[PDB]
Amino acid sequence: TGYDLSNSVFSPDGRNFQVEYAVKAVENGTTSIGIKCNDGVVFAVEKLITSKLLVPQKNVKIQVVDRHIGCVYSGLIPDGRHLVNRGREEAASFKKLYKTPIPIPAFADRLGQYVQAHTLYNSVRPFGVSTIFGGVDKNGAHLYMLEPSGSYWGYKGAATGKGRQSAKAELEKLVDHHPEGLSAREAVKQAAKIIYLAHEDNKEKDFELEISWCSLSETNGLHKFVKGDLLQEAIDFAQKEIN
Amino acid sequence: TQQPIVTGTSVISMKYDNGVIIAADNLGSYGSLLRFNGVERLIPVGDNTVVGISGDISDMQHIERLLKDLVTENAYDNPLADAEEALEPSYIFEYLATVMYQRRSKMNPLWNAIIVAGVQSNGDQFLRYVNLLGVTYSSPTLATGFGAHMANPLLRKVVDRESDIPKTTVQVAEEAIVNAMRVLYYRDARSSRNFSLAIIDKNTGLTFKKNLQVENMKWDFAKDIKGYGTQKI
Incomplete structure (x- = not known):
């Protein structure tokens, strides 16, 4: 055998074991989710409080690309940052040439082609992150989820990390119970709940909630972090549902 | 090595007790041809800085994009x-001042004179000049092009030195700026009647005024002027 020792090598199955091994690193990471809503998207993430010494609200994991796209990821955090740095270069060179801010499907493929490129050679390692991202453009709201292989799709709801199955199950219920659509302010509250429900799969260390959102009405189409009263309102909503 | 094509004339500005005022007409000249009349040459960065640009308009539009991207x-x-890590006027200026000098040093300048007017986070007035050569300076009044020759003399009658700044109110300062814009309309052949004015105050913040016009002009005496010397009729 030895087919798993080198990246970009096909096993006899037709699989790239190094990419599947990168997925294990993603599965090991903290939970992160994405919820598509009426006129925008909502992102949320589980931040494990390793120690009391961690400064609250000052280890931000969700990243903005351009002014209208939000990105969150699970797995190897530095790999996720590298991907976002690239996204920002891609978005900047798009706006530079075409004037208009980069559309979300266009942006999604820019990351996709870059991550896919890291499964083509043995001199690079695949990305150890699944990236949930999206935003609002001229065609409306879009939510995406990108994996180590370079595979990505459009999603109504997306989840990844150690509590992905718990989150997915809870996401599927929202899609069934809200066929006409979920509002932006509702999605923020739901996002909080789902992170709290998905925290049951990582319950040794207690955690810190972090939420962001793009919405054509609420945030004027721009990416903003959910802070202060709106954040505490969402936390209380989640606290009430677990009990 | 460039030559400017579509050009914008004077940018004028001055400090007053609580902040700064900056103004520039809405004209995009094409040599002697007064080609474009809806040009905005004052560009706000955040809610605390306004960058006034004269000279080549294509290079102005490039600078706009840099500030937007900044x-x-x-x-x-x-x-x-x-909040605390928001863009300051001093940051925005130094960035531009770096770019202008780097481009002149590569013998490929941005053909502009720029005045960055704003108010710092500690409440201090910021007003500084930079041009295509990367030459920088600061003064209670700053002006580009014809404004340097005609506006500055008038504005310096109000704020002649640093100690006159606390004595100058926003009403007086704006009146001097508007007066200067009229004088430039009389005498600068590449100026227009329409202009924009911006006030950055440490209390009331950024007030951006559009579609202003030069008014209260003296032209009546022209009827009495006949010929060029001896002619009586």
């Missing part, structure tokens, strides 16, 4: 982007 880049991984 705001975006500052927001990245910055929870305090709208």
Whole structure:
């Protein structure tokens, strides 16, 4: 055998074991989710409080690309940052040439082609992150989820990390119970709940909630972090549902 | 090595007790042809800075995009982007001042004279000049092009030195600026009647005024002027 020792090598199955091994690193990471809503998207993430010494609200994991796209990821955090740095270069060179801010499907493929490129050679390692991202453009709201292989799709709801199955199950219920659509302010509250429900799969260390959102009405189409009263309102909503 | 094509004339500005005023007409000249009349040559960066640009308009539009991209880049991984780590006038200027000098040193300048007017986070007035050569200076009054020759003399009658700044109110300062814009309309052949004016105050913030016009002009005496010397009729 030895087919798993080198990246970009096909096993006899037709699989790239190094990419599947990168997925294990993603599965090991903290939970992160994405919820598509009426006129925008909502992102949320589980931040494990390793120690009391961690400064609250000052280890931000969700990243903005351009002014209208939000990105969150699970797995190897530095790999996720590298991907976002690239996204920002891609978005900047798009706006530079075409004037208009980069559309979300266009942006999604820019990351996709870059991550896919890291499964083509043995001199690079695949990305150890699944990236949930999206935003609002001229065609409306879009939510995406990108994996180590370079595979990505459009999603109504997306989840990844150690509590992905718990989150997915809870996401599927929202899609069934809200066929006409979920509002932006509702999605923020739901996002909080789902992170709290998905925290049951990582319950040794207690955690810190972090939420962001793009919405054509609420945030004027721009990416903003959910802070202060709106954040505490969402936390209380989640606290009430677990009990 | 460039030559400017579509050009914008004077930018004028001055400090007053609580902030700064900056103004520039809405004309995009094409040599002697007064080609474009809806040009905005004052560009606000955030809610605390206004960059006034004269000279080549294509290079002005490039600078606009850099400032626009600077705001975006500052927001990245910055929870305090709208607070303590927001863009200051001094940051924005130094960036431009760097770019202008780097381009002149590569013998490929941005053919512009720029005045960055704003108010710092500590409440201090910021007003500084930079041009295509990368030459920088600061003064209670600053002006580009014809404004340097005609506006500055008038504005310096109000604020002649640093100690006159606390004595000058926003009403007086704005009146001098508007007066100067009229004088430039009389005498600058590449100026227009329509202009924009911006006030950055440490209390009331950024007030951006559009579609102003030069008015209260003296033209009546022209009827009495006949010929060029001896002619009586």
